[PDB]
Write an enzyme that holds these catalytic residues in place. Sequence first.
Site, PDB file in Angstrom:
ATOM      1  N   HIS A   8       0.866  -1.165   0.014  1.00 31.28           N
ATOM      2  CA  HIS A   8       0.122   0.122   0.036  1.00 31.28           C
ATOM      3  C   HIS A   8       0.913   1.343   0.070  1.00 31.28           C
ATOM      4  O   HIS A   8       1.974   1.217   0.367  1.00 31.28           O
ATOM      5  CB  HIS A   8      -0.869  -0.240   1.224  1.00 31.28           C
ATOM      6  CG  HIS A   8      -0.177  -0.117   2.631  1.00 31.28           C
ATOM      7  ND1 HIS A   8       0.472   1.170   3.004  1.00 31.28           N
ATOM      8  CD2 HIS A   8       0.028  -0.984   3.467  1.00 31.28           C
ATOM      9  CE1 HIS A   8       0.889   0.952   4.255  1.00 31.28           C
ATOM     10  NE2 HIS A   8       0.983  -0.494   4.400  1.00 31.28           N
ATOM     11  N   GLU A  74      -0.936  -6.549   7.862  1.00 30.84           N
ATOM     12  CA  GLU A  74       0.414  -6.514   8.225  1.00 30.84           C
ATOM     13  C   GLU A  74       0.462  -7.513   9.570  1.00 30.84           C
ATOM     14  O   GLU A  74      -0.691  -7.685  10.275  1.00 30.84           O
ATOM     15  CB  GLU A  74       0.765  -5.130   8.397  1.00 30.84           C
ATOM     16  CG  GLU A  74       2.305  -4.942   9.289  1.00 30.84           C
ATOM     17  CD  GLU A  74       3.406  -5.476   8.016  1.00 30.84           C
ATOM     18  OE1 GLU A  74       3.743  -4.775   7.139  1.00 30.84           O
ATOM     19  OE2 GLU A  74       3.745  -6.608   8.036  1.00 30.84           O
TER      20      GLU A  74
END
Length: 171
Positions: A8, A74
């Site tokens: 991202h 994550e």
Amino acid sequence: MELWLVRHGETLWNREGRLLGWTDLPLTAEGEAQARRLKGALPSLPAFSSDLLRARRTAELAGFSPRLYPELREIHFGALEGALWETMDPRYKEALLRFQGFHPPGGESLSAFQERVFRFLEGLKAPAVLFTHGGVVRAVLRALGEDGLVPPGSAVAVDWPRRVLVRLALD
């Protein structure tokens, strides 16, 4: 299996050097710009994405409508969420650098993180684009015998679980 993993775009903690795990930060102006540059650079395949804002937004700006999957998150840094990398305990930095023996209090262990990521990838039965995070891309790269460090808003295509196909970075 051809899979395109996308890190991202940047958030404030990128420039600040703070560990960003499950803390739900938004992209920065540049972060969105990076996301837009991805449009037309990624193949039109089914898309999946971490359900965290920065990943979802990246997917959107890139022109996708991804399936949301927390499994693409994550790693959860727990008590270490937000900690400055520069001031992190040597033992923790070492474990992260060597990518092993890492289990922050209130967080997720690297081994559990890997299990979660690889289990998700194993379930993909056809080519797809995956909007995710740095640690996810690095777990995949490292499992494929390569350095798992890639710029925010960049992507890596792999033939899972055999080899890396290409690394794509834009300016």
